[PDB]
Amino acid sequence: SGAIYVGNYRVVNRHLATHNDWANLVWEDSSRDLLVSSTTAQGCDTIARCDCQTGVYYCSSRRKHYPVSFSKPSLIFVEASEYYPARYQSHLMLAVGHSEPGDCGGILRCQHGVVGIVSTGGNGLVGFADVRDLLWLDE
Ligand SMILES: NC(=O)[C@H]1CCCN(C(=O)Cc2ccccc2OC(F)F)C1
Ligand SMILES: [Zn+2]
Numbered sequence: 792s793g794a795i796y797v798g799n800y801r802v803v804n805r806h807l808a809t810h811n812d813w814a815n816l817v818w819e820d821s822s823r824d825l826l827v828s829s830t831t832a833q834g835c836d837t838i839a840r841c842d843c844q845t846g847v848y849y850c851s852s853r854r855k856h857y858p859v860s861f862s863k864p865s866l867i868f869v870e871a872s873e874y875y876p877a878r879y880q881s882h883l884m885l886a887v888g889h890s891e892p893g894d895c896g897g898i899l900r901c902q903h904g905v906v907g908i909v910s911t912g913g914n915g916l917v918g919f920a921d922v923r924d925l926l927w928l929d930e
Pocket of ligand 1: 806824869870872874875880890891892893894895909910911912913914917918
């Protein structure tokens with residue numbers, strides 16, 4: 792679990808969105824596993840606007856942060872679940888690192904700010920849903 796709070800927005804994994812998130816929906820994309828809902832309180836997370844391929848992510852199954860090299864946002868296969876069927880998830884970035892069910896929502900950050908959130912994993916890999924292209928999160 793975990794979310795990004797920037798301005799009047801809350802960014803979460805679409806498969807983990809709540810009734811409140813859906814009732815205050817701004818945008819959602821099943822192919823990216825992202826949902827953005829509106830908030831009354833002002834968020835202060837800074838979003839990165841860069842092409843960094845190195846950063847640090849929070850791994851809740853170890854209560855630790857890990858440094859990672861990650862790939863550029865791309866289309867990548869993801870097995871079924873209480874939430875989705877086999878499909879290509881777009882805007883996904885992979886890294887060699889630990890992740891297990893329960894780790895979704897952990898933030899990935901570089902020197903410029905928030906890069907994305909944990910969305911997939913398995914086999915010694917971790918996948919992050921990129922948010923750097925969502926320029927509207929700032930305005
Ligand atoms: N379709 C999706 O984006 C995910 C929906 C929930 C299920 N998905 C996973 O990958 C679950 C998973 C399995 C083994 C290790 C780590 C895992 O993820 C965690 F890091 F994000 C896929
Ligand atoms: Zn950066």
